[PDB]
Structures are given as C-alpha cells and as structure tokens.
C-alpha cells in the first residue's frame, strides 16, 4: 500500500503465533518488540533511544509477518513503549520513502 | 525521490541558515534537532521513546529545508541522538511510505 503519515503508521503484524499492532519506523535501524517468548538461542545486547538505553534479548532468524509480507530477520526483545519494525525488517518487504 | 532503507535514511536539512544531517523517521512524531539557536519563544514539551523521554523546547513557524523541500512548522530542541524530520513535516514534505 501507499501509507500517508497524518497519524502513526501503525500494522497488525504476527510473530511467535501471536498477532500484535507495531509501528513501521525508517528512524529504528532494529526491530524491538515487547517481551515476549520466542524460540531458539539469544544473546543480550542494548539498544539507543532518544532517552539513553535498554536492555533486550537478541533473537536472529525469526519470522514476521508484517501487513501481509513474510520477512526473516533478527528481532530483539524488551521493555520498548511500542512495537517497532525497523529497517533491518522493512528492506525485505521493499518498504521505501517517498517524496 | 524513492528511498530504500538499506542504510539509514539520512539527508541535509537547512535550517537558521546552517546545513545538518538529520534522519528520516517515520516512527517519530514529532521533529527532534540538537542544542541551537532559534527565534521567538518557546513552549514546554516532554517526547518519550526508547530510554525514557526528555525535555525539549518547542518552537513554532520554524523555516527549514529538508533534502530541498521547504517547509514551515515545529521544531523541537533537546538532547536527541541525531537530528530527527518526525511526520510533522515529513507530511509537509510529501512523503509517504510504499511497499
Ligand atoms: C531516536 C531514533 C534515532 C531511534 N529510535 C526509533 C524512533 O523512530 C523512535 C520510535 C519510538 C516510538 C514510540 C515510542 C518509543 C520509540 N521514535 C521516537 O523516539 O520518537 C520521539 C520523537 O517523536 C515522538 O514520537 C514518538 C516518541 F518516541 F514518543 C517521540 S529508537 O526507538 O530509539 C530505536 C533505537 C535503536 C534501535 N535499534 C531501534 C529503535
Ligand atoms: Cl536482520
Ligand atoms: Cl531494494
Ligand atoms: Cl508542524
Ligand atoms: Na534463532
């Protein structure tokens, strides 16, 4: 689709079985969702923010379904306020800006 | 233009005069510039993201250029981690979103 960007670019995404809302962001250079489980091996990492950082668990090789687009990437885990699709996953559903 | 979001979406923007890098973000409300000289007066505002949120100062009717597309609105001063065009003025812009 064309998403216009008066409000939140917001999609139903599924991961780990589960359907959650998540916000497609060009500013996140990962994707960071909301605790959860997933399957297979972690490590811990911490992520930037605009207001310093948090700590998540990095899971590679899942699973998203975003807006309808399967992509595989590396998802991490923790106490973000919002879901966020970030780049590492939006290239691989061809999401581009436009102007 | 059409940007991919294989690296991140960096532009110049002009603003009081002087050129800067600064990020496209579509998960960003809000336009977020580092510590600078602005006209007029400001008003409080709290923006909150990864890490916390942090104290800005908003100044209304800025004039500033991004990626050679003017455009007139809010800008808000704090210590963000990069410069930030939020969907304030990427809609002033034209920018959408595609996939
Ligand atoms: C700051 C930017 C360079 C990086 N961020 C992504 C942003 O899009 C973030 C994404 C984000 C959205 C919502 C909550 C938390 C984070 N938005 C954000 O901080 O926006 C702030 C300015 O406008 C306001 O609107 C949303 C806000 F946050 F409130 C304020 S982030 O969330 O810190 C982030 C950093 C590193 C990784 N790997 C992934 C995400
Ligand atoms: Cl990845
Ligand atoms: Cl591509
Ligand atoms: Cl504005
Ligand atoms: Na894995």
Chains 1, 2 share one sequence.
């Not at 595989?72 to 061809?94: A, E, H, K, M, S």
């Amino acid at each position: 689709p064309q998403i216009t960007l008066w409000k939140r670019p917001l999609v139903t995404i599924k991961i780990g079985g589960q359907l959650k809302e998540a916000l497609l962001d060009t500013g996140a250079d990962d994707t960071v969702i909301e605790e959860m489980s997933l399957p297979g091996r972690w490590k811990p990492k911490m992520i930037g923010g605009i207001g310093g950082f948090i700590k998540v668990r990095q899971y590679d090789q899942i699973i998203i379904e975003i807006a309808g687009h399967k992509a595989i990437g590396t998802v991490v885990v923790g106490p973000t306020p919002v879901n966020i699709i970030g780049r590492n996953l939006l290239t691989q559903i061809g999401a581009t800006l436009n102007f």
